[PDB]
Amino acid sequence: IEPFLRTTPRPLRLPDGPPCSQRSKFLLMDALKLSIEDPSHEGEGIPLYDA
Amino acid sequence: IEPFLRTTPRPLRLPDGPPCSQRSKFLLMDALKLSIEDPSHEGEGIPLYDA
């Protein structure tokens, strides 16, 4: 058993290289939306005409 | 020339018979509406889908 002291743990060594790139399926914080208002008398509109 | 005094004119004689009936092409004072609101994105809606 080797004892685990307050000086034993070391930081994780992150790899080197060129910076990572986005891989999500859609934009997260850079997304821009075009918005419209749909009053009560709409129910469920076909996604194509909403676009 | 026969003079026209304040006792000469007589009221028009309206005809007799059963009471007259409506002949307008749409209801005037008995009409009822089914209404929907529209903001600004419904600009030129097809009259069939509005109905």
Sequence letter at residue B29: M
Sequence letter at residue B18: P
- Distance CA(A38)–CA(B41), nearest Å, equals 9
Q: Which residue has the tokens 């749909």?
A: A38
Per the CB < 8 A criterion, the answer to whether A41 and B37 are in contact is yes
In the 8-state DSSP scheme, what is residue B49?
H
Sequence letter at residue A6: R
User: Any long-range contacts for B33-41 (C-beta under 8 Å, 24+ apart)?
Assistant: B36/A41, B37/A39, B37/A41, B39/A37, B39/A39, B41/A36, B41/A37
- Transcribe chain A into DSSP letters: -----TTS-----PPPSSPP----SS-SSS---------STTSS--HHHH-
- Measured between beta carbons, the chain A residues lying within 8 angstroms of B37 are 39, 41
Method: cryo-EM
Resolution of the PDB structure in angstroms: 2.8
- Is some CB atom of chain B closer than 8 A to the CB atom of A42? no
Sequence letter at residue A18: P
